[model samples]
Target chain A: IRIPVVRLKFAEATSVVVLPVCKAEEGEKKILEAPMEIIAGGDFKVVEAEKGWKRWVVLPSWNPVAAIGKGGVAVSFRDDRKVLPWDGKEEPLLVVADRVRNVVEADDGYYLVVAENGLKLEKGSDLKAREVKESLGMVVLVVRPPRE
Target chain B: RIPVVRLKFGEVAEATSVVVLPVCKAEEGEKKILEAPMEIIAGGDFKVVEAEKGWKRWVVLPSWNPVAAIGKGGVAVSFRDDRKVLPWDGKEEPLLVVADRVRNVVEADDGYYLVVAENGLKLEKGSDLKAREVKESLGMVVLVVRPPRE
Candidate 1:
């Protein structure tokens, strides 16, 4: 009988993101405050990236377990019954927290115009970006921050 | 040199983003009118993201039929006497063209309206826009700039 090493809100509105605290087996599991790609339903003849790699998954049944032997750790949502995983990770992974791009709401969907990167509309896994357009002229007319 | 065309807004059919215009000196004996096919407004305000190729052309026009493109290598419009030059030489007042991109009404755009957000701006040309005293009201939510002349 192990206690929950983590707490989470397991609903559509307040799902928790799971992330590695570090880059080694000795690393701890930490909860993240961001949205992850939550997939529904599942299968067997799937790419191995779904369970322990960098993919996003939902509907995964999990249990509360203490740290396994020698510098090992496992974590699941506080609910522990039904959860989603993302990041193309074999295990559940977390989303980033620092990208404060002012997501401009449009008809197509949510998009960001970040000055940190380039003049394009970004979406997808960052590997594929469908470029779009806007002018720094909007900033000229609006006087937003140099990075906004 | 005499009687060059001084541009004026006849009436806006419909417009998207806030348009900034440029002007130059003109020669004599021309009738001044503020209609389309003339007064090509070429000022664009882009909030540049990652530095990439192929900038989307910003469009400007009085009627919905549409005309004009700026920031590209070339442009076309209706008037001549009021044509504003590019590669701003730091000679124009009310203008700070740091590499020539546009910033819509910030305090200039947002400052005018407190009711709804105007991430997308709209205006009817020659439509005299006056701000009301109400701090927040559901009046016109579009961003409108005073005619560049004012």
Candidate 2:
């Protein structure tokens, strides 16, 4: 008689944010800026936006803090199934400054990080929301494990 | 007692060429296309344009190949002294070809060979001229060289 070996495959979480730069005046009634979608993978939780910062919750093993380099941190996470037309590559991770208080926490671990400001247009003013494209006109990749 | 040995720089000969694709047909009684002055450093012999089967001698050089490449954009060699004003990078070399002659020698040197043809233009209709301009823009080709030693 042989005993069966139990195997468990862990799910990975990821997040991607697509933001558009807009021009608006202060106290002129908050306008509806272009919708920037932040997608995530796995059993991750997303936090509300605060001070222009967004947040998310991911698994302990899915540490995003390690992904965000110094002077930056992760802001969100979600399930891969939830992400449509998904490529194998990790989703674009948002990073922000330390003082911004944008971070994500998991049951096994907690990674505090911020998302980068993606809407800074290089040239031309009053650009339409549809005119904005992602990947910043160039392809860049970063790889690292999550920080505890 | 010490003896000094002097090193003499030999007579250096440099040559380059440009290729143009889809030879431009000169209609009968059509105005001869006046090519702008292409500066050649240390000028040498001016080889007459040889009319042959798919062959024509446009120009020659003895110094830099980059300058010869500028003929591709057209014959006009826009320049500011020895420096080229086009193409931001001054070191890049250009290759020119005849727009009419499918095969021709644009420039020729002992070791270097620059040939341009219709297919060589990468199927670009007017790239031959553009290539010449690119070379001129780099100011690498010696447009003028002293006539070969008598």
Candidate 3:
């Protein structure tokens, strides 16, 4: 099983998060995956598109949080399909998705965060994203190869 | 009482108004850049030079929507200014030029001179205007996220 781990580097409310373009060039690292904790009085959440059977964070908005519905958690032995409600607090909502992608930067800021099961996180006001282009979007995945 | 230019896009661009950038807290002699939401106490030696070594930081608010900034009510979609912003333009894109605001100045750490913007710093009158040292704690924070590349 080959899975991916997306690492988010957090920063202060009044700061920029720069990542090197690939593994070359220099000057500021560049804002690779930037997302603000929208309701957290503004904090940095460097999210990534992770893979494998791991728990993932979830949000209840479409610009979309779009969670990858691979392994649905069973509450009372029943599959949960509803998005948990947010009481206007700045905390990370968790969910497990096989894949998560973020489209940030460019296109004037409005980006997308798409995951399976159509899991939705946060966007438009998707402060967690630092890059926002379909091509530039990143998805850290956790995949399990087929058995022989 | 300072002038700042916001990047304007299509019809409903966020760069619509002539916003005066708030003063950020800054100091010379370092290569490290400060985090966003920083202030320079409204006073520094903003000396404008052709291409001096200065650090530039861009702030994008969560409310920034590039499409809206360049679509209907934006700056009429000036083809001359219709393109990608820099920093990280390729592999990724910024979600909110909407949340765009200028961060504090970029400079050296340990020992290095800061590229002073034209009137970039508020200096006391002298032969060569000097950057007044930080008088009190102004909460100007410069967070280092990772190691340096250059």
Candidate 4:
């Protein structure tokens, strides 16, 4: 019996940038989200948002989903929204997502998350004061203040 | 004093073939006169009788002197009878002259001639037989002879 041979074309390869988003409170820092841009030929589109994360407005070919490899999940920019006010514009958020490191390959494509201590930012004085009264294990509270 | 500036051309300099009247002799079996076809490129008046013997025929271009250097009207072909022979005819009495190897040089306008002691052939018989004798002496006896001029 003859065995079949398989030919694969590996001409084109995928590329994506992983960014780390961090939040800080009371001199303590935590990784808020690790976002990865799934770019196909350097363009992205948003696919889905995880629970507890705010979804930014999607732009045509402006989303980063295509760049993310298979089995990769999109991280919400909202995770760090309270720390850094986001206007829901994908450019700056995508830039932040691009900073994510520690890309892990999955069955479908590639997944990226922040390396340990990768995301970092100084906490606001008011936020720091609130953190002092809160439990260390408690999830940091993010508030959307009323718009004038 | 002639102004001599040494002008050196690149390798593969052009060469012109000059005509050297091969002197023939009846005693010599047959002589092959290697007649080089003349062309306007390098004025054809020049000739070299015997290259190995250093016999050369220099023909000054424009001037066109030197009986052996020029064509029919330029110089008269003299036979033993002291009568001037025209350009070689098939049946004319052979002119007795020294056979010499010929070559060309481009320095001067005139075709040069060098009488060679070793390559000379005596043409005592008729022109056809004399040419044959000259060619034989030169070890070139098998060449096709052109028809004598009308």
Candidate 5:
């Protein structure tokens, strides 16, 4: 059983903050907008959109929280396959999300949402039908490591 | 905003698009390559250069039919013909022989050896490959590739 090894190098390796993991209270929701720095290059590598991207190593604690917090742009499941392209669990996968907080909707593929257990993936319509506490971002890219 | 290219190993006859080669400019030398997909994020450098010190290498068998000759998801192939050399014509397809996205290839080339992957990683050949069998008659193994995980 071998997973493909791909060299996904980033053009620039700058660190900046964007999405903020907010504090969720029983009554009030705060978009804390915390600054989290994202590195373009590192021991952790999964390629996605252009630039201004962020990386969140789906923490074990994230199993129950919905908000990836401020400064989080995308989540890389290098260890977990709780996401999609179910066939691609062996390959490196990344789920890019929006920076701002928006109404999470099930569109086409899988989505990373704030679940009862931190973060999890739900199908578009299936997610639309279910009630979730928070929607971080729509599933931007379910990168299927190319056989290029 | 930046530009990048996806490179693959194959025969020249399969070369259809604008050819941006990576190595060897001699009039007598030619090679196989491919372009990148548009619907994905691009990566680092995209050019051919001398293999770096300690960089991994493979024996490219572009003419080999990975899936038909070897069973699907096979990691290695046995050499049936005695003559130990293979060449790339323009038609045979090279593909992955193993499951999962990544793995290592070790050569126990007594009679069998590893070929190329769907994305073109191959096994390095052993010493003493004095020619005898024709390229068409040689057998090979490849890494098997499945549809993108759903």
Candidate 6:
């Protein structure tokens, strides 16, 4: 089996943050302690982390439905959302996103809800709060490319 | 950085350009490409070849080939680049062809025309029909990409 690698590209030299990366068969299943171990060693593309960008995690197996079959980079934004501890639930609600939050309705834009099982991208109604047993960070961008 | 000028065709059937990506296997089907509308993020080093905004999408060639990987309905479009060739009939651009993983072409009873892919047999109107010719060569198909209708 080809073990998928998740590379981290942080913004600042002084920036210190280590986010856990994991596999999601349909959800976030196995967490890799030091992703490089499974790599046996890997690829050389450098995506420089921009300002206010906390972290960049590339998931090869975490196929979030059809949106990203190959894999995608889940970017955490430096936001006001507080980070909490994992509540120890088998499948904790990582993030609850409504079609439109603050109760205002708008057209377009899918709701992305991250859970232990996996991520859900859907069109819906009402405000939804995305949560997790423990908070990782607020995902602001999901960069996707064609699958291999 | 130099700006690349993309060519446009009056006939919508011809491919403005070609791209190479994994073809959607029968199990996955074409529905997989339409799961979510992609926001074309092309700029700088990357750029989309043409701008005909109707129903732009990837299509699988229904011809069978000797190679098993491209079997019957394997091969799809990912982007546009002018380096790849498209089909032309002197006056009108009849069909669009894209490349598969192998970057080969196949011959079908349909004629001496080369397909954008190869390796399966051949089918028409959703029915599997046997290919009359034998001889392994490059695999290709007439690929099509257009916007969807509501």
Strongest candidate by lDDT: 5
How far off is residue A74 in model 2, in Å? Answer: 65
DockQ for all candidate structures vs. native:
0.01, 0.00, 0.01, 0.00, 0.02, 0.03
Query: Is model 6 an incorrect, acceptable, medium or high docking prediction?
Result: incorrect
Every model: Cα RMSD to truth: 24.4, 25.0, 21.0, 39.7, 18.6, 18.5
Off-target runs (Cα >4 Å) in candidate 5 are A1-72, A116-118, A143-148, B1-150
- Report the Cα lDDT for residue B131, model 5: 40
Q: After superposition, how far is residue B52 of candidate 6 from its true place, in Å?
A: 32
The best candidate by TM-score is: 5
Which residue segments of model 2 deviate by more than 4 Å? A1-148, B1-30, B34-55, B62-66, B69-71, B74-142
* Model 1 regions lying over 4 Å from their true place: A1-148, B1-53, B56-147
Best by DockQ: 6
Residue-wise C-alpha lDDT for candidate 1, range A20-45, written one tens digit per residue? 11111211122121122222111111
lDDT of 3 by residue, B5-51 (tens): 23332111222221111112233211122222222121111110111
Question: What is the TM-score of model 5 when looking only at chain B?
Answer: 0.18
Chain A, candidate 6, TM-score of 0.23
Cα miss at B44, model 3 (Å)?
A: 35
Model 4 DockQ, alpha carbons vs. true complex: 0.00
Instruction: Rank by lDDT, highest first.
Output: 5, 6, 4, 2, 3, 1
Candidate 4 accuracy as TM-score: 0.15
Model 6 lDDT on a 0 to 1 scale: 0.25
**A1-148: candidate 3 lDDT, tens digit per residue:** 1122122221213222111111112111212322222121111122222211111122222111223332222101011122222332222222222112333433322221334443232333344354424422332221121122
Encode model 5's per-residue lDDT on A28-139: one tens digit a residue.
1222232333322211111122222111121111211233433344344443354443444455444445444345553554555555544565665666676653465554
Tell how far residue A67 is off in model 2, in angstroms.
Answer: 71
Tens-digit per-residue lDDT, B109-136, candidate 6? 4422222234322212111123534343
